[PDB]
Each structure stands twice: as C-alpha cells, then as structure tokens.
Design a protein around this ligand. Structure first.
Ligand SMILES: CC(C)COc1ccc(C(=O)NN)cc1
Lengths: 237, 300
C-alpha cells in the first residue's frame, strides 16, 4: 500500500522501483488579455521519473505542442504522464522493468493503473508523505534542457552525480531531498548557498557542484538552517 | 392463479412471498400460499425465528412445474421440491383449499409493484446465474458469494453474475485508456450490451435480480452487482434514450420498495451521489432523483 514514515529503507533495497512526479508536466503562465480577461500560456514541462537506489532520472520533456487543441489539460496531464511512464516501462528490458512505481500524488494512481493493466505484477503505490520533486526545475541544467526543447524528448541523468562512489543510496537520497526541500522553500537562498564559492564548480557531466565530503557537511548544515529559518520567517517563531 | 403448498410448518418462521411477509408459529396449522399471479417470477423466502442468520429462499415460475415446500429436519430448512405427479398435486391443493389452510397472495388490483420490480427478470436467466440444473427453481441465501468475489470459495454455490470491472482489459481499449475510463460507453454498448448481454432487456433483468437478492437476502455481492450495473450506465456518455428512460423507472420502483430502515447498508453513497450529481446521466434520472431526494436526503 501507501508508503508511510516507518519504511524509509524500502527505497534502497534491490527491488527495482521508480518514483513518478507529475507536478511539472502541465506548466502555465497566467496573464491578462487585451480585453482584460485572463488567459494561460503553456510552457514546456517534464515528467520526473527517478530510481532512488541508483539515481537514474528519466526526464521526459513535455513540449507545449502536446496540449494544442486539447481540453481539460490538468486532467489530460495525468493521463499523458501515465501514457509516457507506461511507454518507458515497455521500452526497458524485462530485467530492468520496475517491480513498483510510487506516484508522488494520489491523483496519478488510477491513470497509471489503467495504463499499466498489461503489467499486473507491477505495484502502483501512493505516498503518505509529499515529496519535494516539484523543485526539480530549480536545478539549472534540468530547467535548461526542458525550456530549450522544440519537440518531445527523453533525457537521461544521474541526479546523484558521482555521490554513490562515496556514500550509500540512503544518504544520497537524503541529501537530494534536503537540497530539493531548500530549493522549494527559498530558491534564491538555496542557490546562493550552492554557488557562493566560485572555486567549487559543476563538472560538465554533473548537476551539482564538486563538493568534498567536508564541504557537503557544511552545505547540508546551511540547507537545514535555511529550511528552519524560512519556517520561522513563515510562521514567525 | 397458482399455488405453492406446504407439507407443514414445524419450526417458527417468517415467510416472505415477493414483497409480502407473514409469521408462522411452530407447528401452526399452515399449508401454503394460493392465488399466486401467473406471468411473473416469484420468490418465496424464509427467516427462522430462532436463527435470524441466513435468510434463504427460492426463485420460481409456476408455469414451469408444480412446486411445494417441505421442511427437512436434517438440513434444518424449508426446501422447495417439484411434484411430478400432476394428479397427486391437484388433489393435495384442493384439500388444503376447501380446508382454507393456505394464505392468499395479497395483491391489490391497482398495484404494479411486483411487475415493476421483475419486468425484465426471466427464470431462464436466473438459472444461468444460479447453477443447479436438476431443479426448475433456484435457491439463494444471504451468504452466497459471487464469481467476482471468488476471484478476489465453493464454485457450485456461487452467484454467476456478469463480471464488471472498470479497471480491466475488458473495459479499456489499448490506446483509449483515458477515453474509455472516463466515458464507459464502449464497455457498456459494445462489450456488455452487444457482446455479452445481447440486449438491454437481459442487462436490466440481471440488474433487477441483483437488487432483489440484495433486498430480500441481504446478499452483499448482489448489492455490489446492482450498483456496478447502475454505475456502468451512468458513467457512459452515450446510452440509448429508451434505456435511460427505462432505467429511471426501474430504479424508481427499487428505491420506492426499499425498507426505510435498510437504506444505510443497501445504498452506496458514492455511486448514488456520482450517478445523480456528477455523471453524464446526472440529468436523465428525474423520477429516481426526486424519490431519492425526498426519501433518503441524508445519503446525498
Ligand atoms: C518515501 C517516503 C517514506 C519518504 O518520503 C519523503 C522523503 C523525503 C522527504 C523530504 O522532503 N526530505 N527533505 C519527503 C518525503
């Protein structure tokens, strides 16, 4: 069933599983029309499909052309997400297909279940705790490839860079989730933290800076401070 | 007008005949039910005084044979049996009938309730749902499970209702996932009506039979079936106009007949609110919506 807060370790066993976040699939800007009504303009989006054990990210870019002439786009976006995840699973060799797919929003359960009827042994599961994957579009290199896309496209990333050479997948996922929560709560401050020191760079083949183990502890501490702060600034504490 | 005689009434029992019921005391002189209207299926049902557990009963059509009831002290129930000796049967009934030891099926002449509840229900289809081919009548009770309930455990004693499952390959065409899930017309019209039921009369007949087993026996799987068959129609954007008008009449009489005190367990809040207020057919069930709003406004 639903992932609770008494099964963190299940993410990092040897059963293949993917998370699927749809919060950046259908993205709009809301603006005024010449007549003074309101309209939306869609911008490119993405499905965030992540193996938490390996860091492999299947970033399916959703080009605005997919919405052309369609109605009820927020509803369609969930079914388009499920269609693309189903297509991804079918494209993988059997021994790479997931045993479980965890959706970050419960409204994805029925669309994905219906698209995966052909895969009765793949468990489709809800999240008792909301993830911070919406902030993926605050990662500059991911945002860049989405906004530059002129057609539908899948791009493969490792969201952990090379961290697994030094740390476990439990620790790497906690770091990723701590960074993503920072970026979601106060993007500018989080990004200031990550880049303040120009001698620490992002390798061409990486998403995050090349911190030493010691520098990661400082970074992680700074992100915790930010989240706690904002949580005061927000609730006045 | 036909008759279902009883050999005797050795245990105290509430006896139902269609929507009517009456109490018989232990060893009370009682020898059956007369004046049963020809042309309809009927159900004769039982709840023992000592064990209100297990309501059970028998669906039958007097045009198909001469049927009587006899208590079995070994199996502990009132059993229906067929009498093949037509002259023996006529003679038994007439004796009980000049001795007035039978109750009369108490139909008011204005009253179309039973017709309206069994309009599409045929014995031959009942006998395909309830498989016991050596008898012309069909036994049902409170505890019997449905074929679909068994997939989620004795197959011979099952209710073989048509399996309906909205998240199944049968219901969902490859490449029309969203379309078929949000608008079930394909599944209703092509798969079920054209494919399985052949026509809307057989569909309504199964729907009506499921309701009656839910109401008379508290059969939970029958209630599930009834609601699934309603929801499949209401969740279809494209339904023949005569089917919607007929469904509205069917449900009207079902809601009218339901005991007021059993609504809490026999009516599924989600299905009815969806069907009456969210579904494609939200505006197509005027009679049903009016009686539901005046009789069970709590549910909604
Ligand atoms: C799979 C669940 C038991 C773990 O879910 C979460 C894990 C991590 C977070 C987070 O934002 N950390 N900063 C939120 C939810």
């Amino acid at each position: 069933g639903a992932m609770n807060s008494s099964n963190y370790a299940e993410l990092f066993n040897n059963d293949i599983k993917l998370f699927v976040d749809d919060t950046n699939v259908y993205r709009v800007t809301v603006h005024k029309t010449f007549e003074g009504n309101v309209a939306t303009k869609a911008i490119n989006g993405c499905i965030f499909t992540l193996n938490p054990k390996t860091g492999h990210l299947f970033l399916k870019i959703i080009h605005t052309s997919v919405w052309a002439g369609q109605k009820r786009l927020s509803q369609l976006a969930k079914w388009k997400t499920a269609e693309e995840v189903s297509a991804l699973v079918r494209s993988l060799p059997k021994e790479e297909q997931p045993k479980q797919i965890i959706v970050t929003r419960k409204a994805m359960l029925d669309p994905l279940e219906v698209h995966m009827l052909d895969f009765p042994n793949i468990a489709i599961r809800p999240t008792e705790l909301r993830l911070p994957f919406s902030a993926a579009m605050s990662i500059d290199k991911l945002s860049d490839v989405v906004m530059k896309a002129t057609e539908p496209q899948m791009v493969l990333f490792n969201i952990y860079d090379d961290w697994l050479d030094r740390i476990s997948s439990y620790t790497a996922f906690s770091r990723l989730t701590l960074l993503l929560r920072a970026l979601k709560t106060n993007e500018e401050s989080a990004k200031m933290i990550l880049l303040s020191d120009p001698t620490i760079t992002i390798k061409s083949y990486h998403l995050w800076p090349s911190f030493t183990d010691e520098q990661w502890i400082t970074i992680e501490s700074q992100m915790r401070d930010l989240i706690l702060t904002e949580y005061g600034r927000k609730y006045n504490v | 007008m036909n008759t279902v005689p009883f050999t005797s009434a050795p245990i105290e029992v509430t006896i139902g005949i269609d929507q009517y019921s009456f109490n018989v005391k232990e060893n009370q002189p009682f020898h059956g039910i007369k004046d049963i209207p020809i042309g309809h299926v009927h159900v004769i049902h039982f709840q023992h005084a000592d064990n209100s557990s297990m309501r059970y009963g028998y669906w039958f059509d007097c045009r198909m044979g001469n049927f009587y009831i006899q208590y079995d002290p070994k199996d502990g129930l009132y059993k229906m049996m067929e009498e093949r000796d037509g002259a023996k049967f006529e003679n038994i009934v007439h004796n009980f009938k000049e001795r007035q030891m039978m109750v009369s099926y108490p139909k008011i002449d204005e009253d179309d309730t039973w017709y309206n509840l069994t309009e599409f229900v045929q014995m031959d289809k009942i006998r395909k749902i309830v498989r016991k081919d050596e008898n012309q009548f069909s036994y049902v009770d409170s505890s019997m499970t449905t074929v679909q309930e068994n997939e989620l455990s004795d197959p011979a004693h099952s209710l073989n209702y048509t399996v309906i499952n909205f998240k199944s390959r049968e219901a969902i065409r490859p490449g029309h996932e969203m379309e078929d899930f949000l608008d079930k017309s394909y599944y209703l019209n092509t798969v079920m009506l054209q494919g399985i039921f052949k026509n809307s009369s057989n569909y309504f007949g199964e729907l009506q039979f499921a309701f009656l087993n839910a109401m008379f026996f508290g059969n939970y799987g029958s209630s599930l079936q009834w609601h699934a068959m309603i929801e499949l129609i209401c969740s279809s954007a494209t339904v023949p106009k005569h089917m919607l008008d007929k469904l509205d009449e069917i449900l009207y009489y079902q809601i009218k007949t339901l005991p007021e005190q059993y609504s809490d367990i026999l009516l599924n809040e989600r299905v009815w609110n969806i069907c009456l207020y969210s579904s494609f057919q939200k505006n197509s069930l005027h009679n049903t919506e009016k009686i539901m709003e005046n009789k069970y406004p709590e549910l909604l």
